[PDB]
Amino acid sequence: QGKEVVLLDFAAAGGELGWLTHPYGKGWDLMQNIMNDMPIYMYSVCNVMSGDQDNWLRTNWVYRGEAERIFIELKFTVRDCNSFPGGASSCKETFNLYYAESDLDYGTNFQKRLFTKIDTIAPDEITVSSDFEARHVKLNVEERSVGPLTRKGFYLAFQDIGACVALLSVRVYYKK
């Protein structure tokens, strides 16, 4: 066997896990919702009309352990830009996945400049406006990985640049 060892599992926290958001106030927010007769928590942002958006979400500091390479599985929905009248030039349908490593936990001290970009994350299925109004949810799954980890711990971060995104699952693991 090559068992997976889970380092962080967002959905499994059941809404008890608060992550840091920057700017405080505008940008990402935790919300709750029912999907499949079960309560589901998600981080969300939908500032698609103003177009100078730079909204960051940062995970808690995760202890690396013996992991040298990590796999990050995201599950998310994104709404169709064309579903917003007047949003041609302001609306986007991607977000960015970043990470940073450190030996210590910085707490609320968030320094986006220490973060390196892993990738642009893009949906394979947008949520068109009849899906939205029917409360059906087009889930997308994207996995990435990053190479040899060196410090005691790490953060992951999600930069919104003007998309209407809901992040439902964030799962980080390593393969034994």
Partner: antibody, heavy 128, light 108 residues
Framework: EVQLLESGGGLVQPGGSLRLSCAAS????????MAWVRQAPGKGLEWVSR????????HYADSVKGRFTISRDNSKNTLYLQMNSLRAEDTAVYYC?????????????????????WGQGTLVTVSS | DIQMTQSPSSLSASVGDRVTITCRAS??????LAWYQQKPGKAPKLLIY???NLHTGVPSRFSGSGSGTEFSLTISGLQPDDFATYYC?????????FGQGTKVEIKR
């Protein structure tokens, strides 16, 4: 430029009926969810009814159910409320209200909806 | 059903003031709360939805906060035309209940 105009308001005996109308202009009516909200004199606001874009799902407040009917004609851009067996308690300004998902900037829809646009309303006095 | 309860029922403020109105739910409503303004003899108008998102056109001196049970509308630097009645409405359930109202009067 979204405009809603209620009409049909007026005086009616207890037990009587009346049919209200809302004439919409300046938008694509077929895409909006429409509703009626009312306001008894000197009191607060009270949701009455709603209807989906297609004529679709209809819901009523427990205080009105079985007595009122909501409908729409998407080719006349008009919203209707048929009010039967009226009582003094139904006396109120009746407001036409609308919601459209294209101006609701949230990733996932809330379960019920809220009112973006409101007409100026029409008074129904039920009294002998 | 879910009952909504606004506090205070009336309030006295001067222009330039910063005033906060409260809205409480008898059971949880996530962030599905809306705030409305009504001046006398006029239709209401939406101020806030999502329990903190500003409707288009609404001045940024309005702001809302809260979740679950407790919510709040704040007006910083009252203008002459903010004296009005303010209503909240939950849209977590189909009953779509509103609060009774909070009337912002002029202090004298």
């Amino acid at each position: 430029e979204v405009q809603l105009l209620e009409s049909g308001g007026g005086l009616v005996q207890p037990g009587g009926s009346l049919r209200l109308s809302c004439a919409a202009s300046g938008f694509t009516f077929s895409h909006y969810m429409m509703a009626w909200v009312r306001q008894a004199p000197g009191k607060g606001l009270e949701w009455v009814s709603r209807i989906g874009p297609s004529g679709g799902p209809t819901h009523y407040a427990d205080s009105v159910k079985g007595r009122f009917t909501i409908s729409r004609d998407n080719s006349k851009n008009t919203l209707y409320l048929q009010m039967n067996s009226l009582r003094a308690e139904d006396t109120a300004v009746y407001y036409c209200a609308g919601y459209d998902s294209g101006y609701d900037y949230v990733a996932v829809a809330g379960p019920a909806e809220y009112f973006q646009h409101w007409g100026q309303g029409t008074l129904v006095t039920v009294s002998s | 059903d879910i009952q909504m309860t606004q506090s205070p029922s009336s309030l006295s403020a001067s222009v330039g003031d910063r005033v906060t109105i409260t809205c409480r739910a008898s059971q949880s409503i996530s962030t599905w709360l809306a705030w409305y303004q009504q001046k006398p003899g006029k239709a209401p108008k939406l101020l806030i939805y999502k329990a903190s998102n500003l409707h288009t056109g609404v001045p940024s001196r309005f702001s809302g906060s809260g979740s679950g049970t407790e919510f709040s509308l704040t007006i910083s630097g009252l203008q002459p035309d903010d004296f009005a009645t303010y209503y909240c409405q939950q849209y977590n359930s189909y009953s779509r209940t509103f609060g009774q109202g909070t009337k912002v009067e002029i202090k004298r």
